[PDB]
Design a protein around this ligand. Structure first.
Ligand SMILES: Cc1[nH]c2c(F)cc(Br)cc2c1CCN
Ligand SMILES: [Ca+2]
Length: 223
């Protein structure tokens, strides 16, 4: 996250770190057994880390649970990033509490101008590279479809939205991938892609979660 703030320990209790020897992506806990992330975060050997603040220090509220199965969306295209969503099932159910909690799925899509909270352990620099230890947060509005398409001609599908600031300076970044965009208490987005981080006229692009709720629910129901 570039231009954000330190969230505070366990204040984003649905935020997960995906670890394969090291943090490589975020995700969102959606019930005791399932995490939502980005399809471009797929790899094998994933351990889900819940209750994290400093990802380099065991502080006492973590739960470390290996993935038993990952399911990349059937229509994910890795060239265009269309349908950039994945589900990860945990080998055992997480223990839910104030600091480890699921985030509700949307019942309808969100509107331009809605305020959202984006969070992650990604790069905090727009030029250069610095990776934080503690969770970072950014409040950012959803941008109009027309602004989003103007920023990225020919690249924005019906499964994507932009959020952030056209002036630059505040954005998600590398390593925030797969993490949450939460708006009015619902998981509306997944950190997906962009051109650089926090660059003028290049806001972040996010998977439009509301288009996937039927698939998420029926996947969970049979897996
Ligand atoms: C999700 C993602 N991953 C990135 C990456 F690996 C390198 C760079 Br430069 C940008 C990004 C973004 C977009 C952030 N709005
Ligand atoms: Ca920790």
């Amino acid at each position: 996250i570039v231009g954000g703030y330190t969230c505070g320990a366990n204040t984003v209790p649905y935020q997960v770190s995906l670890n394969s020897g090291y943090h490589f992506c975020g995700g969102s806990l959606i019930n005791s057994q399932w995490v939502v992330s980005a399809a471009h975060c797929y790899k094998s050997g994933i351990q889900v880390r819940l209750g994290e603040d400093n990802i380099n220090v065991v502080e006492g509220n973590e739960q470390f649970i290996s993935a038993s199965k990952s399911i990349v969306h059937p229509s994910y295209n890795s060239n265009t990033l269309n349908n950039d969503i994945m589900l990860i099932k945990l080998k055992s159910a997480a223990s839910l509490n104030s600091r480890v909690a699921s985030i509700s799925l949307p019942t309808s899509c969100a509107s331009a101008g809605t305020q959202c909270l984006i969070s992650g352990w990604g790069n905090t620099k727009s030029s250069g590279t610095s990776y934080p230890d503690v969770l970072k947060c950014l409040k950012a509005p959803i941008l109009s479809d027309s602004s989003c398409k103007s920023a990225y001609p020919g690249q924005i599908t019906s499964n994507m939205f932009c959020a952030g600031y056209l002036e630059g300076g505040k954005d998600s970044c590398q390593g925030d991938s797969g993490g949450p965009v939460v708006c009015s208490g619902k998981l509306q987005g997944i950190v997906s892609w962009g051109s650089g981080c926090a660059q003028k006229n290049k806001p972040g692009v996010y998977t439009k979660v509301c288009n996937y709720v039927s698939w998420i629910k029926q996947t969970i129901a049979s897996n």
